[PDB]
């Protein structure tokens, strides 16, 4: 009766979606073939797979997501790898020529020829499900497909389905390192679409994942194949209350109203804790207070900002595991006592909790330990304006010499969108400072 | 899916083309007979990018090879790999140019191009989605430079929405083996800089010092020089042919390397270059790759980046690796060497990751870097062209074939305004 649909865009999206769906296989016990194991001859244990996996009369479970990318090379590893029989032959959309780190190639010239093919399967996955909350978007700012094609996908989806929910997990550019050069162009020019054609948008920074995975899990030199496990661990704790039973359930509609106070303010921030190794797990006791303190600690913060310099507007607790509600209230009443953490004076109740019973599972070869309880943050704070300020300063000095303009003008779009995208943000940063100003 | 049409011009272009197709045939596991003799299965996924399918399980390259003398097709077919090139792809005339850009650009290269266009059209339309073309020729001789710059001036109008790569051989002041090559160079670069997308500079001075000092050899024949230039020339299309984490083809490198359409000159380099007596002693780890590369002696051009500014740089890596160390090391050299980078553009480094190394190796790196310091070599040949032309000598080879005298003036006027554009960023 409940279903969820995920749309993963770009090379970032198709690579985090592989680790996202292998965990979904392991929570419901789905083998890479696509069924219950043949050792178990009677099944249908609980209809928690109905929201993530389809049902066929032969006993096969098919996922309810779609993968889109303009690069065929990273897509066909799913066709070649272990999970070839599990994923549908149609649910993985393949391009022919990549956008090549550009916005106009992904938007106006190549994004048009495949925007109708995906929408057919989006409609096909929409009438399968009786009840749909909305769509999850796993896209990247720096990618050509994740910027250009997404800036037409969210626009067309908003008129394809009016009041449907729209959640985004965006791979935000890191403030120090980057794999490209023209990523401020790819980041700014897609913000004009996403500020009006999205409901909620969590940001993920890779270099903050780099330090967190290094200093906490005691694993030096990580790889993307384990970062996507961490991001895939975040996605399961959000949708845990939908699938699994809990003391009180949080919907996909519950936190989209409790983290977005203004239509121009829809940028929360994610944080996961505890993140410890197997060797560190058994020495340290893991209390509810000791896992909620690291969440509010800016050292464990997953986007490279500081709430000490900023101020929160809203937060969201995702408690999953062996947790009782008594010390949850003792923890959050203790959080309200420290004056180092500062809230705004107009949102005196900034808490929403969600309780799930089943502790998180672990994967063979993964980095995280077998843990009994965990908590995920979805907090909205104004410290992102610190990150936006240093992103536009780089954008303004890069545009002052009119570099890389010929890569965009000759593709078909006009040069007036460059000035508008800089100005529309400048009003948005003015909106960011005005909500932070108290009475 | 995505194909590459490979174009060669000149005797230098033929001698570099034999070794270039040697190492890819080694990399993709191809015998001198023509049949795949390998051990893996991922090596057969992206074969159509360079090899056309045939009957009997044979794969032949889609390369066009041109020259004006017949004395180079005999040596090309006499190579260890000459039995795999299809005999229809060779184009040769009955009379050469003989170190003259004028012979190949108006009179003798004018009739050859109408056959080469037929050869490239019957092959480029046989694919499904061509990524683009790639040139490798020499400016030091008019066989591949007089007419090779005319193929650039002809396929650009026919196939406009494509990428073209050139591995050009701009000459050198010490290994100058022709009197009149200042004329052959400047008259080629003037027609080059307007009608191409990506250019490198392969200088034989740089290859000579590398194999003498870095590789520590005694007799570096041209086969060793052709191996060093083709390691980078194959190391630029790694992610096109093999999967990885950060796939990056030529056009993804070009959009980050070309901020202005007249800024398309680069400085190639190759990291895993160590002597045989120093092979066991050195520990191969990605700080060592990014430290050996950024030295000025590894570069393939006859310029010094300490006299200029690193405008933008690229990096393509190979082998199964962890990107924590390479992202840390590229940030360290960016922070420490703050005076060698321009300040009007941040994040000047482009990163590409492939998980497959070449044979006999586990990790590798390829460098493509645009710098203001590359302008020094145009100044070296501008003063020599001015010195030769102000005495009004050697024009009887040139003005007697239909070239007006004002063509030398516009070749000066476009070139010195080009280096005046390069002057502002330093």
């Amino acid at each position: 009766m409940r279903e969820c649909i995920s749309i993963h865009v770009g090379q970032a999206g198709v690579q985090i979606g592989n680790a996202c769906w292998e965990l979904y296989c392991l929570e419901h016990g789905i083998q890479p073939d696509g069924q219950m194991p043949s050792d178990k001859t009677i099944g249908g244990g609980d209809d928690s797979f109905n929201t993530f996996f389809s049902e066929t009369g032969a006993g096969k479970h098919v996922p309810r997501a779609v993968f889109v990318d303009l690069e065929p090379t990273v897509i066909d590893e799913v066709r070649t790898g272990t999970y070839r029989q599990l994923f549908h032959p149609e649910q993985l959309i393949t391009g022919k020529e990549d956008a090549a780190n550009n916005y106009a190639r992904g938007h106006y010239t190549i994004g048009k020829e495949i925007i109708d093919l995906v929408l057919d399967r989006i409609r096909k996955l929409a009438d399968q499900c009786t009840g749909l909350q909305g769509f999850l978007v796993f896209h990247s700012f720096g990618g050509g497909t994740g910027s250009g094609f997404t800036s037409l996908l969210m626009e067309r989806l908003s008129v394809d389905y009016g009041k449907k929910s729209k959640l985004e997990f965006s791979i935000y550019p890191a403030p120090q390192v980057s794999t490209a050069v023209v990523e401020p162009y790819n980041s700014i020019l897609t913000t004009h679409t996403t500020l009006e054609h999205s409901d909620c948008a969590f940001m993920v920074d890779n270099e903050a994942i780099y330090d967190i995975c290094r200093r906490n899990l005691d694993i030096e030199r990580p790889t993307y194949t384990n970062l996507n496990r961490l991001i895939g661990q975040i996605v399961s704790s959000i949708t845990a209350s939908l699938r699994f039973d809990g003391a009180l359930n949080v919907d996909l509609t519950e936190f989209q109203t409790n983290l977005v106070p203004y239509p121009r303010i829809h940028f929360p921030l994610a944080t996961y804790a505890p993140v410890i190794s197997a060797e560190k797990a058994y020495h340290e006791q893991l209390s509810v207070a000791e896992i909620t303190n690291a969440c509010f600690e800016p050292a464990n913060q997953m986007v490279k900002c500081d709430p000490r310099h900023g101020k929160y507007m809203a937060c969201c607790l995702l408690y999953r595991g062996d947790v009782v509600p008594k010390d949850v209230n003792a923890a959050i009443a203790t959080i309200k006592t420290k004056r180092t953490i500062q809230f705004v004076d107009w949102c005196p109740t900034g808490f929403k909790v969600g309780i799930n019973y089943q502790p998180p599972t672990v994967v063979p070869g993964g980095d995280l330990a077998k843990v009994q309880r965990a908590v995920c943050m979805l907090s909205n704070t104004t410290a992102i304006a610190e990150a936006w300020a240093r992103l536009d300063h780089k954008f303004d000095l890069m545009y002052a010499k009119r570099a890389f303009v010929h890569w965009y003008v000759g593709e078909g779009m006009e040069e007036g969108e460059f000035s508008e995208a800089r100005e529309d943000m400048a009003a948005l940063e003015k909106d960011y400072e005005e909500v932070g100003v108290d009475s | 899916m995505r194909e590459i049409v490979h174009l060669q011009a000149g005797q230098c272009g033929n001698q570099i083309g034999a070794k270039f197709w040697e190492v890819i045939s080694d990399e993709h596991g191809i015998d001198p007979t023509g049949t795949y003799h390998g051990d893996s299965d991922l090596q057969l996924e992206r074969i159509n990018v360079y090899y056309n399918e045939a009957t009997g399980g044979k794969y032949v390259p889609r390369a066009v090879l041109v020259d004006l003398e017949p004395g180079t097709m005999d040596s090309v077919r006499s190579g260890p790999f000459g039995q795999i090139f299809r005999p229809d792809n060779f184009v040769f005339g009955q009379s050469g140019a003989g170190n003259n850009w004028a012979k190949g650009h108006y009179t003798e290269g004018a009739e050859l191009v109408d056959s080469v266009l037929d050869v490239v059209r019957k092959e480029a339309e046989s694919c499904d989605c061509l990524q683009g073309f790639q040139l490798t020729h020499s400016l030091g001789g008019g066989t591949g430079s007089g007419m090779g710059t005319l193929l650039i001036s002809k396929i650009r109008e026919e196939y406009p929405d494509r990428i073209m790569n050139t591995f050009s051989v701009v000459p050198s002041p010490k290994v100058s083996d022709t009197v009149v090559e200042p004329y052959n160079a400047t008259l080629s670069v003037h027609q080059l800089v307007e009608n191409t997308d990506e250019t490198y500079c392969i200088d034989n001075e740089a290859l000579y010092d590398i194999c003498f000092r870095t590789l520590k050899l005694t007799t570096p024949t041209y086969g060793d020089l052709n191996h060093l230039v083709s390691a980078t020339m194959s190391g630029v299309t790694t992610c096109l042919r093999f999967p990885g984490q950060l796939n990056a083809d030529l056009r993804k490198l070009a959009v980050n390397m070309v901020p202005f359409p007249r800024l398309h000159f680069f400085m190639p380099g190759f990291a895993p270059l160590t002597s045989r007596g120093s092979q066991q002693y050195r520990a191969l780890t990605v700080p060592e790759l990014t430290q050996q590369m950024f030295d000025a002696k590894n570069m393939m051009a006859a310029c010094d980046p300490r006299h200029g500014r690193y405008l933008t740089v690229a990096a393509v890596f190979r082998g199964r690796m962890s990107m924590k160390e390479v992202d840390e090391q590229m940030l360290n050299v960016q922070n420490k060497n703050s005076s060698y980078f321009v300040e009007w553009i941040p994040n000047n480094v482009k990163t590409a990751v492939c998980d497959i190394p070449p044979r006999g190796l586990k990790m590798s790196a390829t460098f493509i870097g645009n710098s203001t310091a590359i302008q020094e070599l145009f100044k070296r040949i501008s003063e020599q062209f001015t010195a030769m032309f102000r005495r009004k000598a050697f024009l009887h080879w040139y003005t007697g074939e239909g070239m007006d005298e004002m063509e030398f003036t516009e070749a000066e006027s476009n070139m010195n305004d080009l280096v005046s554009e390069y002057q502002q960023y330093q």
């Binding site: 899990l217 005691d218 694993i219 030096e220 030199r221 990580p222 790889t223 194949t225 384990n226 190794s277 197997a278 060797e279 070869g365 980095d367 | 520990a283 780890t285 990605v286 700080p287 199964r320 690796m321 962890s322 160390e325």
Partner: peptide, 23 residues
Amino acid sequence: EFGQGHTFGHLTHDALGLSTFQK
């Protein structure tokens, strides 16, 4: 008495599959 890290290569490269616990 009268009556009678293993390798700096492993510590500086590729610790993702084998962490410090697995080293």
